């Protein structure tokens, strides 16, 4: 949404002017981050942790 603005001074019986809310956007992309590792069955078994 656009910032807060101000009302304007107006004559009595005069038509009120339009200062409606106006919008823009922020675009996201989303990059895939990845990490991996591999362990043999033998290593998985024998490790003390």
């Amino acid at each position: 949404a656009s910032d807060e603005e101000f009302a304007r001074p107006t004559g009595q019986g005069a038509e009120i002017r339009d200062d409606g809310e106006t919008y823009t956007t922020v675009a996201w992309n989303a990059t895939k981050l990845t990490e991996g590792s591999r362990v043999t069955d033998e290593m998985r078994d024998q490790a003390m942790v």
Binding site: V39, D41, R44, D45
Partner: protein, 112 residues
């Protein structure tokens, strides 16, 4: 007996359920630290398979269980587990039949 097995209504439903899904229900006897009886403790039936002699009686139980990224396996004697079979191939069948595997084709036909 009613004091030894307070919640037998739940245990009967649990073991009876397992013994319809799997070939057997199976478990341990358990004791208090003082060595008075605690419970009959069921064991996860998909983790255990029986090993049996030339006259068909179970002599040992072989257990395989999941662990991070693999399996741990152990063997226990028939001396201190117990097991129950609802569905049998014969009156001598001490190992039993899964009704799921007996009807796997109908299950597949349904799902497909």
């Amino acid at each position: 007996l009613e004091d030894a097995f307070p919640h037998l209504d739940l245990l009967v439903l649990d073991l009876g359920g397992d013994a319809l899904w799997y070939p057997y229900a199976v478990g341990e006897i358990q004791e208090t630290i003082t060595g008075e009886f605690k419970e009959a403790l069921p064991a996860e039936p998909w983790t255990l398979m029986p090993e049996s002699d030339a006259q068909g009686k179970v002599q040992a139980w072989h257990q395989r269980t999941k662990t991070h990224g693999g399996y741990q396996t152990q063997t226990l004697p028939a001396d201190d587990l117990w097991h129950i079979v609802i569905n049998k191939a014969s009156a001598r069948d001490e190992v039993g039949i899964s009704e799921v595997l007996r009807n796997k084709d109908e299950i597949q036909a349904f799902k497909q």
